[PDB]
């Protein structure tokens, strides 16, 4: 049978994983890095590509 | 002296409070209710107040 410590390990793990997922979600909403995937342009002197 | 359960109670409490604060932060960033505190207007026919 599972001891009390073995069960606590699983519950506390779930609580810290819940926290980790919430914190990741905060950081995405606030400061997720944004890729510049490409560029295009029309500029003077025929500068029509980057 | 404090038992193991009494100490676990305090640690698990901190983990669930950390989670609760993170979840509240998510809900603020995503869907915090916004008060309309006042209004003003200029509309036809001299309708210059709400």
């Amino acid at each position, epitope marked *: *049978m*599972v001891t009390d410590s073995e*069960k606590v390990a*699983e*519950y506390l793990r779930r609580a810290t994983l*819940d926290l980790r*997922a*919430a914190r990741q979600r905060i950081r995405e909403l606030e400061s997720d890095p944004i890729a510049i995937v490409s560029m295009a342009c029309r500029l003077p002197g025929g500068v029509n590509t980057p | 002296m404090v*038992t193991d359960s*009494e100490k676990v109670a305090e640690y698990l409490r901190r983990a669930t409070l950390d989670l609760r604060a993170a979840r509240q932060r998510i809900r603020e960033l995503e869907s915090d209710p916004i008060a309309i505190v006042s209004m003003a207007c200029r509309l036809p026919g001299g309708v210059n107040t709400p």
Partner: antibody, heavy 118, light 114 residues
Framework: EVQLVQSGGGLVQPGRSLRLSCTASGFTFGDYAMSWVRQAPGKGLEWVGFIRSKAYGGTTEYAASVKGRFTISRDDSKSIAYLQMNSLKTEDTAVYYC?????????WGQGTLVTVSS | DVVMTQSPLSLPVTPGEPASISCRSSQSLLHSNGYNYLDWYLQKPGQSPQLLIYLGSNRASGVPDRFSGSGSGTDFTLKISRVEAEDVGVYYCMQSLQTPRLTFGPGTKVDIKR
């Protein structure tokens, strides 16, 4: 994301053997106990057995109805849990679920139907 | 000395409206650490089980926040604030004081009120 992908079941005759697998992805498999739970057609969920993580000794426990016929093992390098089923009987017919956790079953495989029939 | 839980056999529900599932154990599930060792699971038809609530009142990440749990000792409730039609299936309250759990029991069959 967390995935538990089950395979290896199907039709089998009484007395024969099958090995079910549960292939995990998206978490550290080696940190979790893994459990098997089964559901005979139209019936409730019955606990089959489970295996502990290495952190708690890697040992197994089994329901009395399968003890001495079924064995659970794990491969932490491939992230697979196995259910080895020997001496299968018709009443073993069931959908077999693998689940993460030995006490808290917080993520479940999609299930594998095993039909024992001659 | 075996620890069992019982919940209602059936429970018709109405989408838009709340629902409550009660749970009673043969023995207090309150541990010295302050938590009740009672978890709630749901099996939707043709789907595998899923966790909803652990240690009485903690909602796992990704579970809709219309689900909550409460209670203590021997009496527990799963509450759905506003039922959705996708919430039909079998709900199980499972004690974790005594392991292993050999069965999930008959659970509470939730279906559409009419």
């Amino acid at each position: 994301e967390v995935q538990l992908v089950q395979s290896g079941g199907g039709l089998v005759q009484p007395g024969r053997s099958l090995r079910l697998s549960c292939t995990a992805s998206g978490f550290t498999f080696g940190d979790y106990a893994m459990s098997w739970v089964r559901q005979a057609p139209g019936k409730g969920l019955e606990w089959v057995g489970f295996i502990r993580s290495k952190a708690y000794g890697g040992t197994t426990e089994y329901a009395a109805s399968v003890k001495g016929r079924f064995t659970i093992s794990r491969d932490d390098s491939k992230s697979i849990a196995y259910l080895q089923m020997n001496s299968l009987k018709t009443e073993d017919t069931a959908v077999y679920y693998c689940t993460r956790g030995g006490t808290l079953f917080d993520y479940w495989g999609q299930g594998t139907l095993v039909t024992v029939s001659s | 000395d075996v620890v069992m839980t019982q919940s209602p056999l059936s429970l018709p529900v109405t989408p838009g409206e709340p629902a409550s599932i009660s749970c009673r154990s043969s023995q207090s599930l309150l541990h010295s650490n302050g938590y009740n060792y009672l978890d709630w699971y749901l099996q939707k038809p043709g789907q595998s089980p899923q966790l909803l609530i652990y240690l009485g009142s903690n909602r796992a990440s990704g579970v809709p926040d219309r689900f909550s749990g409460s209670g203590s000792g021997t009496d527990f409730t799963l509450k759905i604030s506003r039922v959705e039609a996708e919430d039909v299936g079998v709900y199980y309250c499972m004690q974790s004081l005594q392991t292993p759990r050999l069965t999930f029991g008959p659970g509470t069959k939730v279906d559409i009120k009419r």
